[PDB]
Amino acid sequence: MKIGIIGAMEEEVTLLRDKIDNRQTITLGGCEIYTGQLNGTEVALLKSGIGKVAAALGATLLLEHCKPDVIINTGSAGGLASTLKVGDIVVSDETRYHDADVTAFGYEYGQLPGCPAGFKADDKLIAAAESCIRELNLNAVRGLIVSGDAFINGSVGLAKIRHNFPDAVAVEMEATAIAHVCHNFNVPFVVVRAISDVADQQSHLSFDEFLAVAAKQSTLMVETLVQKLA
Amino acid sequence: MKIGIIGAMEEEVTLLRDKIDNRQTITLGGCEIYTGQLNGTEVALLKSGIGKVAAALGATLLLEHCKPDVIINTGSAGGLASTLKVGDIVVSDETRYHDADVTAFGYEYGQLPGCPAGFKADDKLIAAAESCIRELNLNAVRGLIVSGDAFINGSVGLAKIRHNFPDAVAVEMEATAIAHVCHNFNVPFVVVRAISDVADQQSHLSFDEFLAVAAKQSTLMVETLVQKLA
Ligand SMILES: Nc1ncnc2c(CN3C[C@H](CSCC[C@H](N)C(=O)O)[C@@H](O)C3)c[nH]c12
Numbered sequence: 310m311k312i313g314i315i316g317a318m319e320e321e322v323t324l325l326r327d328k329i330d331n332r333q334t335i336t337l338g339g340c341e342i343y344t345g346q347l348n349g350t351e352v353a354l355l356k357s358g359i360g361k362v363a364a365a366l367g368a369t370l371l372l373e374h375c376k377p378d379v380i381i382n383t384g385s386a387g388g389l390a391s392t393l394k395v396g397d398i399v400v401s402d403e404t405r406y407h408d409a410d411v412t413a414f415g416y417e418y419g420q421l422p423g424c425p426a427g428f429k430a431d432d433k434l435i436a437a438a439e440s441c442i443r444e445l446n447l448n449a450v451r452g453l454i455v456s457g458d459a460f461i462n463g464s465v466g467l468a469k470i471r472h473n474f475p476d477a478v479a480v481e482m483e484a485t486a487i488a489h490v491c492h493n494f495n496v497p498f499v500v501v502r503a504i505s506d507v508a509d510q511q512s513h514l515s516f517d518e519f520l521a522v523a524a525k526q527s528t529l530m531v532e533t534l535v536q537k538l539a
Numbered sequence: 540m541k542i543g544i545i546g547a548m549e550e551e552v553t554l555l556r557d558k559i560d561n562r563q564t565i566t567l568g569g570c571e572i573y574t575g576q577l578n579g580t581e582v583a584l585l586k587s588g589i590g591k592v593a594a595a596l597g598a599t600l601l602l603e604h605c606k607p608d609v610i611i612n613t614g615s616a617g618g619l620a621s622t623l624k625v626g627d628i629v630v631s632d633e634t635r636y637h638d639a640d641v642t643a644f645g646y647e648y649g650q651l652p653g654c655p656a657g658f659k660a661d662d663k664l665i666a667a668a669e670s671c672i673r674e675l676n677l678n679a680v681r682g683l684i685v686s687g688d689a690f691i692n693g694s695v696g697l698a699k700i701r702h703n704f705p706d707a708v709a710v711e712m713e714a715t716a717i718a719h720v721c722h723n724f725n726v727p728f729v730v731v732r733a734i735s736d737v738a739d740q741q742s743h744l745s746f747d748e749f750l751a752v753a754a755k756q757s758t759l760m761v762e763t764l765v766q767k768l769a
Pocket residue numbers: 317318358359360384385386387459460461462480481482483505506507508512516641644652653
């Protein structure tokens with residue numbers, strides 16, 4: 310089995326990169342792919358850069374060159390569910406764009422022409438993720454994760470998302486793009502992130518302080534998940 | 540020499556596809572690529588689907604499989620510049636995301652981390668496209684084109700774009716994502732689109748009525764430009 314992992318930032322992939330045995334690096338299209346074994350399992354870890362287009366480009370390359378059986382998207386997120394604290398885990402059961410709007414032609418808000426309104430994560434991946442959270446005794450929320458090309462920092466940006474997607478448990482900037490690419494290539498996908506901030510007026514400060522903690526916890530989950538899937 | 544051409548919709552690529560000699564089709568990742576000769580010049584034409592992610596996925600696949608020397612993005616657009624009427628031509632000198640916002644971390648509005656604030660179109664491609672405009676006797680504006688994952692339909696959506704990007708001459712949903720991917724692969728890029736609507740409260744009705752006109756005019760431009768380039 311070959312597991313694909315994608316993260317956006319250096320801080321989000323660096324801990325996992327260090328655990329890869331017999332690691333080799335490729336650079337292409339501004340993305341770095343690190344291949345090798347993580348605790349015996351073949352992985353390919355991509356550092357995509359930030360936002361929807363950087364993620365889609367990275368995901369397409371990973372699929373085409375490394376042909377993984379599944380993809381796991383890791384890193385930080387903004388917490389929207391009230392029970393979430395910094396460091397806690399969020400797992401996607403679904404992803405939607407919070408900033409897509411073709412409602413003039415009668416599409417659902419967030420839906421793009423030719424796409425489902427939302428991309429459902431793979432049930433088996435979700436089940437395995439849940440079993441890891443339980444084994445590690447971590448606090449987690451499963452649900453809808455929304456993505457857009459905006460860092461959410463309270464005020465109107467946050468209000469708009471809460472209004473349009475009241476069931477969204479977290480916000481980030483890459484997940485739904487990776488889900489979209491995976492849908493088109495029919496490859497199983499899941500998001501396993503950790504909370505760096507709660508996307509409010511303090512989110513820029515919380516994010517700076519807690520990105521490292523979010524990277525540490527998401528890395529813990531992802532390596533536990535890789536081990537379970539094998 | 541091989542010219543890459545990317546369009547989002549069936550209507551925007553059907554006229555050009557019908558003119559390809561020795562036409563071979565490839566399907567992958569939800570996208571169709573048609574390869575062959577267009578009046579003796581080798582081309583690869585991709586039908587991407589709609590929006591930033593679909594366009595990025597599409598562009599990445601074209602660049603990887605077909606290795607084109609340049610990319611031309613064609614199709615329709617929403618006119619913003621006062622002199623544009625339905626069917627008139629817009630040529631990118633630059634593209635920017637109108638919906639990207641990481642200003643909380645000090646970036647310019649529309650800039651994503653790790654990216655320039657705008658992507659400059661290739662000077663040689665622009666000059667060729669200006670000679671096509673002249674040869675075909677068309678009305679055209681060269682300028683900033685902005686992209687986002689929304690169909691612009693008047694109200695506050697339009698006011699926001701006009702305020703943030705008062706020099707934008709047109710708006711659409713794919714161009715900047717393609718410019719971004721081309722940037723990352725160091726491939727020359729230009730947008731050559733035709734106006735289907737003026738992005739106001741009637742833009743959805745104007746689009747339905749004038750998509751075929753915009754497609755015909757952009758096709759005329761693209762066929763000419765391919766010849767000029769070879
Ligand atoms: N509040 C939030 N809104 C959107 N995304 C997130 C995230 C997830 N990712 C974190 C990251 C934030 S943008 C980082 C910019 C960075 N400080 C820089 O200056 O380059 C982007 O890849 C999305 C955590 N909190 C968020």
